[PDB]
Protein backbone atom coordinates (compact mmCIF):
# COMPACT_ATOMS: atom_id res chain seq x y z
CA UNK A 1 0.00 0.00 0.00
CA UNK A 2 1.07 3.56 0.80
CA UNK A 3 4.71 4.56 1.29
CA UNK A 4 5.57 6.66 4.34
CA UNK A 5 8.11 7.33 7.10
CA UNK A 6 7.86 3.83 8.57
CA UNK A 7 8.92 1.97 5.40
CA UNK A 8 11.50 4.49 4.14
CA UNK A 9 14.45 2.11 3.74
CA UNK A 10 12.39 -0.01 1.34
CA UNK A 11 13.39 2.55 -1.31
CA UNK A 12 16.99 1.35 -1.17
CA UNK A 13 16.53 -2.42 -1.16
CA UNK A 14 17.23 -4.54 -4.22
CA UNK A 15 13.67 -4.70 -5.62
CA UNK A 16 13.63 -2.42 -8.66
CA UNK A 17 11.23 0.48 -8.16
CA UNK A 18 10.52 3.82 -9.75
CA UNK A 19 9.02 7.02 -8.45
CA UNK A 20 6.77 8.77 -10.96
CA UNK A 21 6.04 12.47 -10.58
CA UNK A 22 3.61 14.18 -12.95
CA UNK A 23 3.70 17.74 -11.52
CA UNK A 24 5.61 19.13 -14.49
CA UNK A 25 3.83 17.28 -17.28
CA UNK A 26 1.23 19.98 -18.08
CA UNK A 27 2.71 23.47 -17.66
CA UNK A 28 1.09 26.76 -18.65
CA UNK A 29 1.60 30.50 -18.51
CA UNK A 30 -1.66 32.37 -17.75
CA UNK A 31 -2.10 35.67 -19.62
CA UNK A 32 -4.63 38.30 -20.69
CA UNK A 33 -6.17 38.27 -24.15
CA UNK A 34 -6.60 41.39 -26.27
CA UNK A 35 -10.25 41.45 -25.19
CA UNK A 36 -9.20 41.32 -21.53
CA UNK A 37 -10.13 37.67 -21.01
CA UNK A 38 -7.67 35.12 -19.65
CA UNK A 39 -6.10 32.28 -21.60
CA UNK A 40 -3.36 29.75 -21.08
CA UNK A 41 -0.33 28.99 -23.22
CA UNK A 42 1.23 25.57 -22.68
CA UNK A 43 4.99 25.20 -22.42
CA UNK A 44 7.03 22.04 -22.64
CA UNK A 45 6.87 19.68 -19.70
CA UNK A 46 8.34 16.44 -18.47
CA UNK A 47 7.61 13.24 -16.61
CA UNK A 48 10.07 12.67 -13.76
CA UNK A 49 10.61 8.90 -13.42
CA UNK A 50 13.36 8.07 -10.94
CA UNK A 51 15.00 4.88 -9.64
CA UNK A 52 15.88 5.97 -6.06
CA UNK A 53 18.44 3.19 -5.61
CA UNK A 54 20.53 3.91 -8.72
CA UNK A 55 19.79 7.56 -9.48
CA UNK A 56 18.66 6.71 -13.00
CA UNK A 57 16.23 9.38 -14.19
CA UNK A 58 14.07 8.67 -17.24
CA UNK A 59 13.07 12.20 -18.25
CA UNK A 60 10.29 12.02 -20.81
CA UNK A 61 9.94 15.44 -22.37
CA UNK A 62 6.32 16.41 -23.09
CA UNK A 63 6.22 18.71 -26.09
CA UNK A 64 3.33 21.21 -26.28
CA UNK A 65 2.13 19.60 -29.53
CA UNK A 66 0.70 16.68 -27.53
CA UNK A 67 -1.97 19.05 -26.18
CA UNK A 68 -3.07 20.48 -29.55
CA UNK A 69 -6.81 20.12 -30.02
CA UNK A 70 -7.31 18.28 -26.76
CA UNK A 71 -9.80 19.07 -23.99
CA UNK A 72 -9.55 18.68 -20.22
CA UNK A 73 -5.77 18.87 -20.35
CA UNK A 74 -5.14 18.46 -16.62
CA UNK A 75 -7.03 15.14 -16.76
CA UNK A 76 -5.36 14.11 -20.01
CA UNK A 77 -1.95 14.83 -18.52
CA UNK A 78 -2.42 12.10 -15.94
CA UNK A 79 -3.35 9.55 -18.62
CA UNK A 80 -0.52 10.69 -20.93
CA UNK A 81 1.84 10.22 -17.98
CA UNK A 82 0.52 6.71 -17.38
CA UNK A 83 0.76 5.94 -21.11
CA UNK A 84 4.42 7.02 -21.26
CA UNK A 85 5.40 5.18 -18.03
CA UNK A 86 3.74 2.02 -19.38
CA UNK A 87 5.60 2.43 -22.69
CA UNK A 88 8.87 2.84 -20.75
CA UNK A 89 8.28 -0.32 -18.74
CA UNK A 90 7.45 -2.29 -21.89
CA UNK A 91 10.64 -0.99 -23.51
CA UNK A 92 12.84 -2.32 -20.68
CA UNK A 93 14.13 -5.91 -20.57
CA UNK A 94 12.10 -8.05 -18.19
CA UNK A 95 14.91 -8.14 -15.62
CA UNK A 96 15.04 -4.31 -15.61
CA UNK A 97 11.31 -3.78 -15.23
CA UNK A 98 10.21 -2.40 -11.83
CA UNK A 99 8.47 -4.51 -9.24
CA UNK A 100 6.79 -1.37 -7.82
CA UNK A 101 5.96 2.08 -9.18
CA UNK A 102 5.33 4.76 -6.56
CA UNK A 103 3.31 7.81 -7.70
CA UNK A 104 3.85 11.06 -5.86
CA UNK A 105 0.21 12.16 -6.31
CA UNK A 106 -2.80 9.91 -5.63
CA UNK A 107 -4.58 11.05 -8.80
CA UNK A 108 -2.06 9.02 -10.83
CA UNK A 109 -3.11 5.70 -9.24
CA UNK A 110 -6.07 4.84 -11.45
CA UNK A 111 -4.50 6.12 -14.72
CA UNK A 112 -1.35 4.10 -14.08
CA UNK A 113 -3.16 1.01 -12.79
CA UNK A 114 -5.33 0.91 -15.94
CA UNK A 115 -2.36 1.38 -18.27
CA UNK A 116 -0.43 -1.35 -16.43
CA UNK A 117 -3.16 -4.04 -16.47
CA UNK A 118 -0.84 -6.14 -18.65
CA UNK A 119 1.61 -6.13 -15.68
CA UNK A 120 -0.45 -7.52 -12.77
CA UNK A 121 2.72 -8.27 -10.78
CA UNK A 122 3.89 -4.63 -10.77
CA UNK A 123 2.52 -2.91 -7.67
CA UNK A 124 1.26 0.65 -8.11
CA UNK A 125 1.60 2.48 -4.80
CA UNK A 126 0.92 5.94 -3.43
CA UNK A 127 3.06 7.69 -0.86
CA UNK A 128 2.45 9.84 2.20
CA UNK A 129 5.86 11.49 1.70
CA UNK A 130 5.71 15.06 0.37
CA UNK A 131 8.52 14.76 -2.13
CA UNK A 132 9.81 17.92 -3.77
CA UNK A 133 10.20 16.49 -7.27
CA UNK A 134 8.29 19.43 -8.80
CA UNK A 135 11.52 21.39 -8.30
CA UNK A 136 13.24 19.22 -10.96
CA UNK A 137 12.72 22.08 -13.40
CA UNK A 138 14.94 24.20 -11.16
CA UNK A 139 17.92 22.03 -12.17
CA UNK A 140 19.36 24.13 -14.98
CA UNK A 141 20.41 21.32 -17.29
CA UNK A 142 17.03 19.59 -16.96
CA UNK A 143 15.10 22.80 -17.58
CA UNK A 144 17.31 23.46 -20.63
CA UNK A 145 16.67 20.17 -22.36
CA UNK A 146 12.92 20.44 -21.70
CA UNK A 147 12.57 23.99 -23.04
CA UNK A 148 14.73 23.31 -26.12
CA UNK A 149 12.80 20.20 -27.23
CA UNK A 150 11.03 20.57 -30.57
CA UNK A 151 9.55 17.04 -30.47
CA UNK A 152 8.79 14.33 -27.90
CA UNK A 153 12.04 13.00 -26.49
CA UNK A 154 13.34 10.84 -23.66
CA UNK A 155 16.64 11.80 -22.01
CA UNK A 156 18.45 9.63 -19.47
CA UNK A 157 20.33 11.20 -16.57
CA UNK A 158 21.81 10.06 -13.27
CA UNK A 159 20.36 12.57 -10.80
CA UNK A 160 23.08 11.63 -8.25
CA UNK A 161 26.02 12.41 -10.59
CA UNK A 162 28.83 10.20 -9.17
CA UNK A 163 27.79 10.46 -5.53
CA UNK A 164 27.21 6.71 -5.18
CA UNK A 165 30.99 6.19 -5.57
CA UNK A 166 31.28 7.75 -2.11
CA UNK A 167 27.89 7.56 -0.31
CA UNK A 168 24.99 5.16 -0.07
CA UNK A 169 21.71 5.55 -1.96
CA UNK A 170 19.91 6.43 1.27
CA UNK A 171 22.31 9.31 1.80
CA UNK A 172 22.17 10.28 -1.87
CA UNK A 173 18.38 10.39 -1.87
CA UNK A 174 18.40 12.42 1.35
CA UNK A 175 20.83 14.87 -0.28
CA UNK A 176 18.66 15.09 -3.39
CA UNK A 177 15.45 15.71 -1.43
CA UNK A 178 17.21 18.41 0.63
CA UNK A 179 18.50 20.16 -2.48
CA UNK A 180 15.12 19.96 -4.22
CA UNK A 181 13.19 21.08 -1.13
CA UNK A 182 15.49 24.12 -0.89
CA UNK A 183 15.10 24.94 -4.58
CA UNK A 184 11.33 24.67 -4.14
CA UNK A 185 11.21 26.92 -1.07
CA UNK A 186 13.53 29.66 -2.38
CA UNK A 187 15.03 28.95 -5.79
CA UNK A 188 17.15 32.10 -5.96
CA UNK A 189 18.83 31.54 -2.60
CA UNK A 190 19.32 27.82 -3.19
CA UNK A 191 20.96 28.43 -6.56
CA UNK A 192 23.18 31.10 -5.00
CA UNK A 193 24.31 28.56 -2.40
CA UNK A 194 25.11 26.01 -5.09
CA UNK A 195 26.96 28.27 -7.54
CA UNK A 196 28.34 31.19 -5.49
CA UNK A 197 31.88 29.78 -5.48
CA UNK A 198 33.28 30.03 -9.05
CA UNK A 199 36.05 27.51 -8.30
CA UNK A 200 33.61 24.60 -7.88
CA UNK A 201 32.24 23.71 -11.29
CA UNK A 202 29.66 21.34 -12.77
CA UNK A 203 31.20 18.65 -14.94
CA UNK A 204 29.81 18.51 -18.47
CA UNK A 205 28.31 15.07 -17.71
CA UNK A 206 26.85 16.10 -14.31
CA UNK A 207 23.92 18.11 -12.99
CA UNK A 208 25.33 19.40 -9.69
CA UNK A 209 28.70 20.92 -8.73
CA UNK A 210 31.75 18.77 -7.95
CA UNK A 211 31.78 19.33 -4.20
CA UNK A 212 34.19 17.54 -1.96
CA UNK A 213 32.79 15.57 0.97
CA UNK A 214 33.50 18.48 3.32
CA UNK A 215 31.96 21.00 0.92
CA UNK A 216 28.81 18.89 0.66
CA UNK A 217 28.47 19.05 4.45
CA UNK A 218 28.72 22.84 4.31
CA UNK A 219 26.32 23.03 1.34
CA UNK A 220 23.86 20.71 3.07
CA UNK A 221 23.99 22.84 6.22
CA UNK A 222 23.32 25.98 4.15
CA UNK A 223 20.25 24.35 2.58
CA UNK A 224 18.84 23.38 5.99
CA UNK A 225 19.39 26.94 7.19
CA UNK A 226 17.57 28.25 4.09
CA UNK A 227 14.61 25.95 4.67
CA UNK A 228 14.35 26.76 8.38
CA UNK A 229 14.64 30.49 7.60
CA UNK A 230 11.91 30.52 4.94
CA UNK A 231 9.84 28.53 7.42
CA UNK A 232 10.28 31.50 9.77
CA UNK A 233 10.07 34.23 7.11
CA UNK A 234 6.85 32.39 6.24
CA UNK A 235 5.18 31.79 9.61
CA UNK A 236 7.03 34.63 11.37
CA UNK A 237 8.99 32.61 13.96
Amino acid sequence: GAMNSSNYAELFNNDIKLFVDDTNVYRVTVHKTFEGNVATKAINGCIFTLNPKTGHLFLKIIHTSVWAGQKRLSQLAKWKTAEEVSALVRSLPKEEQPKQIIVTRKAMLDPLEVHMLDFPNIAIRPTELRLPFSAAMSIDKLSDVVMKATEPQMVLFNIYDDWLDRISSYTAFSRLTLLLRALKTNEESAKMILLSDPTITIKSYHLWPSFTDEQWITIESQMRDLILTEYGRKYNV
Partner: protein, 300 residues
Protein backbone atom coordinates in the same frame (compact mmCIF):
# COMPACT_ATOMS: atom_id res chain seq x y z
CA UNK B 1 -53.76 -19.27 -8.18
CA UNK B 2 -50.96 -21.74 -7.13
CA UNK B 3 -50.22 -23.10 -3.68
CA UNK B 4 -47.11 -23.97 -1.68
CA UNK B 5 -48.29 -26.26 1.12
CA UNK B 6 -46.27 -26.92 4.27
CA UNK B 7 -46.06 -30.34 5.89
CA UNK B 8 -46.05 -28.57 9.30
CA UNK B 9 -44.47 -25.54 11.07
CA UNK B 10 -42.30 -27.34 13.98
CA UNK B 11 -40.20 -24.29 14.86
CA UNK B 12 -41.31 -20.64 15.33
CA UNK B 13 -40.33 -18.68 12.17
CA UNK B 14 -40.97 -15.38 10.28
CA UNK B 15 -41.99 -16.65 6.81
CA UNK B 16 -41.65 -14.22 3.82
CA UNK B 17 -43.44 -14.67 0.46
CA UNK B 18 -42.16 -12.03 -1.95
CA UNK B 19 -42.53 -8.65 -0.17
CA UNK B 20 -44.87 -10.03 2.58
CA UNK B 21 -43.84 -11.56 5.93
CA UNK B 22 -45.82 -13.17 8.81
CA UNK B 23 -45.08 -15.05 12.06
CA UNK B 24 -45.86 -18.79 12.61
CA UNK B 25 -45.50 -20.05 16.26
CA UNK B 26 -43.63 -23.28 17.13
CA UNK B 27 -46.06 -26.15 16.22
CA UNK B 28 -48.83 -23.83 14.97
CA UNK B 29 -51.55 -25.54 12.77
CA UNK B 30 -50.20 -23.81 9.62
CA UNK B 31 -50.16 -25.59 6.26
CA UNK B 32 -48.86 -23.09 3.68
CA UNK B 33 -49.61 -20.31 1.25
CA UNK B 34 -52.32 -20.23 -1.39
CA UNK B 35 -53.47 -17.88 -4.16
CA UNK B 36 -49.90 -17.29 -5.39
CA UNK B 37 -49.82 -15.04 -8.92
CA UNK B 38 -49.07 -17.41 -11.72
CA UNK B 39 -46.78 -15.69 -14.18
CA UNK B 40 -44.21 -14.34 -11.69
CA UNK B 41 -41.11 -15.89 -10.11
CA UNK B 42 -41.54 -15.87 -6.35
CA UNK B 43 -39.35 -16.25 -3.31
CA UNK B 44 -40.36 -17.90 -0.08
CA UNK B 45 -38.03 -17.11 2.77
CA UNK B 46 -37.40 -17.78 6.39
CA UNK B 47 -35.94 -16.29 9.55
CA UNK B 48 -36.06 -18.52 12.58
CA UNK B 49 -37.25 -16.84 15.76
CA UNK B 50 -34.42 -18.40 17.77
CA UNK B 51 -31.58 -17.61 15.31
CA UNK B 52 -32.21 -14.44 13.34
CA UNK B 53 -28.84 -15.34 11.83
CA UNK B 54 -29.11 -16.97 8.41
CA UNK B 55 -32.06 -15.68 6.49
CA UNK B 56 -32.61 -18.24 3.73
CA UNK B 57 -35.16 -19.02 1.07
CA UNK B 58 -36.17 -20.45 -2.28
CA UNK B 59 -36.76 -18.88 -5.67
CA UNK B 60 -39.41 -20.78 -7.61
CA UNK B 61 -42.03 -20.57 -10.39
CA UNK B 62 -45.19 -22.63 -9.82
CA UNK B 63 -45.50 -23.24 -13.56
CA UNK B 64 -42.43 -25.50 -13.34
CA UNK B 65 -43.77 -28.02 -10.82
CA UNK B 66 -45.64 -28.65 -7.56
CA UNK B 67 -43.49 -27.43 -4.68
CA UNK B 68 -43.98 -27.76 -0.96
CA UNK B 69 -42.11 -26.95 2.25
CA UNK B 70 -41.10 -29.48 4.87
CA UNK B 71 -38.96 -28.85 7.92
CA UNK B 72 -35.85 -31.05 8.25
CA UNK B 73 -34.91 -31.53 11.93
CA UNK B 74 -31.44 -32.80 11.00
CA UNK B 75 -30.34 -29.88 8.83
CA UNK B 76 -32.48 -27.53 10.88
CA UNK B 77 -34.28 -25.69 8.12
CA UNK B 78 -37.45 -25.48 6.15
CA UNK B 79 -36.71 -27.20 2.82
CA UNK B 80 -38.45 -26.81 -0.49
CA UNK B 81 -39.22 -30.06 -2.26
CA UNK B 82 -40.96 -31.04 -5.49
CA UNK B 83 -43.89 -33.49 -5.45
CA UNK B 84 -44.04 -35.42 -8.72
CA UNK B 85 -47.40 -37.15 -7.98
CA UNK B 86 -49.78 -34.51 -9.32
CA UNK B 87 -52.98 -36.05 -7.97
CA UNK B 88 -51.49 -36.64 -4.52
CA UNK B 89 -50.44 -32.98 -4.38
CA UNK B 90 -53.82 -31.67 -5.55
CA UNK B 91 -55.57 -33.81 -2.95
CA UNK B 92 -53.30 -32.59 -0.14
CA UNK B 93 -53.79 -28.95 -1.12
CA UNK B 94 -57.56 -29.32 -1.41
CA UNK B 95 -57.74 -30.78 2.14
CA UNK B 96 -55.65 -27.94 3.60
CA UNK B 97 -57.70 -25.34 1.72
CA UNK B 98 -61.05 -26.81 2.85
CA UNK B 99 -59.90 -26.80 6.54
CA UNK B 100 -58.64 -23.13 6.05
CA UNK B 101 -55.10 -23.97 7.17
CA UNK B 102 -53.32 -21.70 4.66
CA UNK B 103 -52.59 -17.93 4.56
CA UNK B 104 -53.48 -16.19 1.27
CA UNK B 105 -51.06 -14.23 -0.99
CA UNK B 106 -53.03 -10.96 -1.18
CA UNK B 107 -54.04 -9.57 -4.58
CA UNK B 108 -54.76 -5.81 -3.97
CA UNK B 109 -56.67 -3.60 -6.57
CA UNK B 110 -53.75 -1.01 -7.03
CA UNK B 111 -50.71 -3.37 -6.70
CA UNK B 112 -47.92 -3.94 -9.31
CA UNK B 113 -44.99 -3.87 -6.89
CA UNK B 114 -43.93 -7.48 -7.36
CA UNK B 115 -44.26 -7.36 -11.15
CA UNK B 116 -42.22 -4.15 -11.14
CA UNK B 117 -39.44 -5.74 -9.06
CA UNK B 118 -39.29 -8.99 -11.10
CA UNK B 119 -40.24 -7.81 -14.62
CA UNK B 120 -37.07 -9.23 -16.22
CA UNK B 121 -36.27 -11.99 -13.72
CA UNK B 122 -36.52 -15.50 -15.19
CA UNK B 123 -36.24 -18.82 -13.38
CA UNK B 124 -33.94 -20.21 -16.06
CA UNK B 125 -31.50 -17.36 -15.50
CA UNK B 126 -31.73 -17.70 -11.71
CA UNK B 127 -30.79 -21.38 -12.05
CA UNK B 128 -27.62 -20.42 -13.93
CA UNK B 129 -26.60 -17.94 -11.23
CA UNK B 130 -27.52 -20.50 -8.49
CA UNK B 131 -26.21 -23.89 -9.61
CA UNK B 132 -28.14 -26.92 -8.29
CA UNK B 133 -29.45 -28.59 -11.41
CA UNK B 134 -31.33 -31.46 -9.75
CA UNK B 135 -33.92 -28.98 -8.34
CA UNK B 136 -36.29 -26.68 -10.24
CA UNK B 137 -36.09 -24.09 -7.45
CA UNK B 138 -33.05 -22.22 -6.11
CA UNK B 139 -31.79 -21.87 -2.54
CA UNK B 140 -30.17 -18.60 -1.45
CA UNK B 141 -29.07 -17.41 2.00
CA UNK B 142 -27.40 -14.49 3.77
CA UNK B 143 -23.92 -16.00 3.70
CA UNK B 144 -23.46 -17.26 0.12
CA UNK B 145 -20.54 -15.59 -1.64
CA UNK B 146 -20.26 -14.60 -5.27
CA UNK B 147 -17.81 -15.97 -7.82
CA UNK B 148 -16.14 -12.54 -7.77
CA UNK B 149 -15.84 -12.49 -3.97
CA UNK B 150 -14.15 -15.92 -4.18
CA UNK B 151 -11.53 -14.61 -6.63
CA UNK B 152 -10.56 -11.89 -4.13
CA UNK B 153 -14.65 -20.63 -0.81
CA UNK B 154 -16.93 -23.56 -1.65
CA UNK B 155 -17.76 -23.21 -5.38
CA UNK B 156 -20.95 -25.32 -5.34
CA UNK B 157 -22.57 -22.87 -2.90
CA UNK B 158 -21.73 -19.67 -4.80
CA UNK B 159 -23.74 -16.99 -6.57
CA UNK B 160 -22.46 -17.03 -10.18
CA UNK B 161 -23.26 -13.45 -11.02
CA UNK B 162 -21.60 -11.95 -14.09
CA UNK B 163 -18.23 -10.53 -13.07
CA UNK B 164 -17.96 -6.77 -13.58
CA UNK B 165 -14.57 -5.19 -12.90
CA UNK B 166 -13.85 -1.64 -14.11
CA UNK B 167 -10.06 -2.12 -13.84
CA UNK B 168 -9.81 -5.28 -15.90
CA UNK B 169 -8.54 -6.14 -19.35
CA UNK B 170 -12.12 -7.14 -20.22
CA UNK B 171 -13.25 -3.59 -19.44
CA UNK B 172 -10.39 -1.73 -21.12
CA UNK B 173 -9.35 -1.98 -24.78
CA UNK B 174 -5.58 -1.68 -25.32
CA UNK B 175 -4.96 1.82 -26.60
CA UNK B 176 -8.31 3.17 -25.34
CA UNK B 177 -7.34 3.15 -21.68
CA UNK B 178 -8.48 6.66 -20.80
CA UNK B 179 -11.48 6.55 -23.13
CA UNK B 180 -12.83 3.23 -21.86
CA UNK B 181 -12.18 3.95 -18.17
CA UNK B 182 -13.89 7.33 -18.22
CA UNK B 183 -16.75 6.30 -20.58
CA UNK B 184 -17.72 2.67 -20.06
CA UNK B 185 -19.97 2.42 -23.16
CA UNK B 186 -17.83 -0.19 -24.90
CA UNK B 187 -17.79 -2.41 -21.82
CA UNK B 188 -21.55 -2.01 -21.36
CA UNK B 189 -22.72 -2.30 -24.98
CA UNK B 190 -20.13 -4.51 -26.68
CA UNK B 191 -18.66 -6.67 -23.91
CA UNK B 192 -21.64 -7.10 -21.60
CA UNK B 193 -24.82 -6.49 -23.60
CA UNK B 194 -23.87 -7.81 -27.03
CA UNK B 195 -21.30 -10.29 -25.72
CA UNK B 196 -22.39 -11.85 -22.43
CA UNK B 197 -26.00 -10.94 -21.69
CA UNK B 198 -27.17 -10.88 -25.35
CA UNK B 199 -29.86 -8.28 -24.55
CA UNK B 200 -30.84 -5.70 -21.98
CA UNK B 201 -33.65 -7.83 -20.57
CA UNK B 202 -31.15 -10.43 -19.30
CA UNK B 203 -28.98 -7.64 -17.86
CA UNK B 204 -31.92 -6.11 -16.02
CA UNK B 205 -33.01 -9.56 -14.85
CA UNK B 206 -29.70 -10.17 -13.11
CA UNK B 207 -29.73 -6.63 -11.72
CA UNK B 208 -33.21 -7.14 -10.24
CA UNK B 209 -32.29 -10.60 -8.87
CA UNK B 210 -29.17 -9.18 -7.21
CA UNK B 211 -31.21 -6.41 -5.57
CA UNK B 212 -33.82 -8.85 -4.26
CA UNK B 213 -31.20 -11.16 -2.74
CA UNK B 214 -29.57 -8.16 -1.11
CA UNK B 215 -32.87 -6.98 0.33
CA UNK B 216 -34.42 -10.24 1.44
CA UNK B 217 -31.30 -12.06 2.67
CA UNK B 218 -28.88 -9.25 3.45
CA UNK B 219 -26.56 -10.91 0.95
CA UNK B 220 -23.57 -8.59 0.71
CA UNK B 221 -22.15 -9.88 -2.57
CA UNK B 222 -25.55 -9.42 -4.18
CA UNK B 223 -25.62 -5.80 -3.03
CA UNK B 224 -22.19 -5.31 -4.62
CA UNK B 225 -23.44 -6.80 -7.90
CA UNK B 226 -26.56 -4.61 -7.99
CA UNK B 227 -24.52 -1.45 -7.49
CA UNK B 228 -21.89 -2.48 -10.05
CA UNK B 229 -24.59 -3.04 -12.65
CA UNK B 230 -26.15 0.36 -11.96
CA UNK B 231 -22.76 2.03 -12.05
CA UNK B 232 -21.80 0.39 -15.36
CA UNK B 233 -24.86 1.95 -17.02
CA UNK B 234 -24.58 5.37 -15.37
CA UNK B 235 -20.88 5.56 -16.32
CA UNK B 236 -21.59 4.91 -20.01
CA UNK B 237 -22.10 7.97 -22.20
CA UNK B 238 -23.91 5.95 -24.86
CA UNK B 239 -26.88 3.97 -23.60
CA UNK B 240 -30.05 3.17 -25.57
CA UNK B 241 -32.86 5.52 -24.57
CA UNK B 242 -35.21 2.64 -23.80
CA UNK B 243 -32.68 1.14 -21.40
CA UNK B 244 -32.34 4.39 -19.46
CA UNK B 245 -36.07 4.83 -19.19
CA UNK B 246 -36.49 1.25 -18.04
CA UNK B 247 -33.57 1.52 -15.57
CA UNK B 248 -35.27 4.57 -14.03
CA UNK B 249 -38.46 2.55 -13.44
CA UNK B 250 -36.56 -0.47 -12.11
CA UNK B 251 -34.62 1.56 -9.55
CA UNK B 252 -37.66 3.63 -8.59
CA UNK B 253 -39.54 0.52 -7.48
CA UNK B 254 -36.47 -0.93 -5.71
CA UNK B 255 -35.94 2.27 -3.73
CA UNK B 256 -39.67 2.46 -3.04
CA UNK B 257 -39.74 -1.08 -1.64
CA UNK B 258 -36.52 -0.91 0.41
CA UNK B 259 -37.22 -0.83 4.16
CA UNK B 260 -36.47 2.66 5.40
CA UNK B 261 -34.38 1.25 8.27
CA UNK B 262 -32.08 -0.83 5.98
CA UNK B 263 -31.05 2.09 3.77
CA UNK B 264 -27.79 2.52 5.71
CA UNK B 265 -26.49 -0.95 4.79
CA UNK B 266 -28.15 -1.61 1.41
CA UNK B 267 -27.30 1.69 -0.35
CA UNK B 268 -23.75 2.67 -1.31
CA UNK B 269 -23.32 6.43 -0.84
CA UNK B 270 -20.56 6.71 -3.46
CA UNK B 271 -22.37 4.90 -6.25
CA UNK B 272 -25.64 6.74 -5.75
CA UNK B 273 -24.12 10.21 -5.51
CA UNK B 274 -21.95 9.47 -8.54
CA UNK B 275 -24.86 8.03 -10.52
CA UNK B 276 -27.41 10.75 -9.75
CA UNK B 277 -25.12 13.80 -9.69
CA UNK B 278 -21.79 13.21 -11.51
CA UNK B 279 -22.33 10.53 -14.15
CA UNK B 280 -23.22 10.78 -17.81
CA UNK B 281 -26.74 9.73 -16.82
CA UNK B 282 -27.07 12.22 -13.95
CA UNK B 283 -30.08 13.76 -15.75
CA UNK B 284 -31.67 10.58 -17.14
CA UNK B 285 -33.10 8.98 -13.95
CA UNK B 286 -35.79 11.47 -12.98
CA UNK B 287 -38.12 9.11 -11.11
CA UNK B 288 -35.26 7.48 -9.19
CA UNK B 289 -33.67 10.83 -8.31
CA UNK B 290 -36.97 12.22 -7.05
CA UNK B 291 -37.76 9.28 -4.74
CA UNK B 292 -34.15 9.10 -3.51
CA UNK B 293 -34.10 12.82 -2.66
CA UNK B 294 -37.47 12.60 -0.85
CA UNK B 295 -36.86 9.34 1.01
CA UNK B 296 -33.10 9.24 1.67
CA UNK B 297 -31.81 12.82 1.45
CA UNK B 298 -29.23 12.00 4.13
CA UNK B 299 -27.40 9.53 1.90
CA UNK B 300 -26.95 12.39 -0.56
Amino acid sequence: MNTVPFTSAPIEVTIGIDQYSFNVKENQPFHGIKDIPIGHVHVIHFQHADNSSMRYGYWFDCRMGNFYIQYDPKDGLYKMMEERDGAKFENIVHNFKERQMMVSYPKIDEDDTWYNLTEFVQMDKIRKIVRKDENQFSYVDSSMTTVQENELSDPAHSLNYTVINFKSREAIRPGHEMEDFLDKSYYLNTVMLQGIFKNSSNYFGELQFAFLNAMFFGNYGSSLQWHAMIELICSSATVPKHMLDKLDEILYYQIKTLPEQYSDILLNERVWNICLYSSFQKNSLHNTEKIMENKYPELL
